[PDB]
C-alpha cells in the first residue's frame, strides 16, 4: 500500500526510488537526514545534482525539469523531490 | 514582524522577498496559492530561477546556490525562498 500523487521518472527509476525511500525510512530517523540520504542516493544514481523536500504540511509550487521530479507519501510524512 | 531562520541573498533581495511574502499572504490565504504567488513574484523580481515553499511543519536539507537562498518565518507559517 503506497501512494504517489504526481511523478516524472522512468518505471524502473520509480521502483528504485520507492525502494530507496523505504530503506531511507528504515535507516534514518531525522526527516532532513533521510531527505539528504535520499537526495545523495538519487544524485549518485540519477545524474546529480538534485534536491528534495521533507516535511508534514507544505504546499508545493515550483518549475522542475522534465522527467526529473517525483512526489509520494509513505508512512506519516510526504516526500517531494525534483532535480535542480 | 517576520523572522528569517536562514538567508543567503542580498539585503535588498531579502527585503524584496519579505515584501512579496507579506503581499502574497495578504492576497492569497492558501498555502499552495501563497507559495505560487510568492514564486511568481520572486521569479519576476530577481531572476527567472525561483523556488518558494510555504508550510508550517516542513524541514528539509537541499543544496542551494549562493546569494539565492532564504528561509524566513512570517507569523505562524514558514517561508523558504530560493532560486531553482
Amino acid at each position: 500500500k503506497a501512494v504517489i500523487k504526481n511523478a516524472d521518472m522512468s518505471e524502473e527509476m520509480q521502483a528504485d526510488a520507492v525502494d530507496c525511500a523505504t530503506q531511507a525510512l528504515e535507516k534514518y530517523n531525522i526527516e532532513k537526514d533521510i531527505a539528504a540520504y535520499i537526495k545523495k542516493e538519487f544524485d549518485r544514481k540519477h545524474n546529480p545534482t538534485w534536491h528534495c523536500i521533507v516535511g508534514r504540511n507544505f504546499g508545493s509550487y515550483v518549475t522542475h525539469e522534465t522527467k526529473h521530479f517525483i512526489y509520494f507519501y509513505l508512512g506519516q510524512v510526504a516526500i517531494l523531490l525534483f532535480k535542480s | 514582524k517576520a523572522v528569517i531562520k536562514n538567508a543567503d541573498m542580498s539585503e535588498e533581495m531579502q527585503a524584496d522577498a519579505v515584501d512579496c511574502a507579506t503581499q502574497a499572504l495578504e492576497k492569497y490565504n492558501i498555502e499552495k496559492d501563497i507559495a505560487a504567488y510568492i514564486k511568481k513574484e520572486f521569479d519576476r523580481k530577481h531572476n527567472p530561477t525561483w523556488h518558494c515553499i510555504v508550510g508550517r511543519n516542513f524541514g528539509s536539507y537541499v543544496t542551494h546556490e549562493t546569494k539565492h537562498f532564504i528561509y524566513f518565518y512570517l507569523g505562524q507559517v514558514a517561508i523558504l525562498l530560493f532560486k531553482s
Binding site: 504526481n6 516535511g55 504540511n57 508545493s60 509550487y61 518549475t63 507519501y73 510526504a78 | 499552495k32
Partner: peptide, 23 residues
C-alpha cells in the same frame, strides 16, 4: 510547472497534657 501539497492525609493533634508534665 508543478503543484502539490502535503500520599494519604495524616492528622496529628497534640493532646491536652500529653506532652506537658505538671510536676
Amino acid at each position: 510547472d508543478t503543484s502539490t501539497q502535503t500520599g494519604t492525609d495524616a492528622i496529628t493533634q497534640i493532646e491536652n497534657g500529653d506532652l506537658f508534665d505538671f510536676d
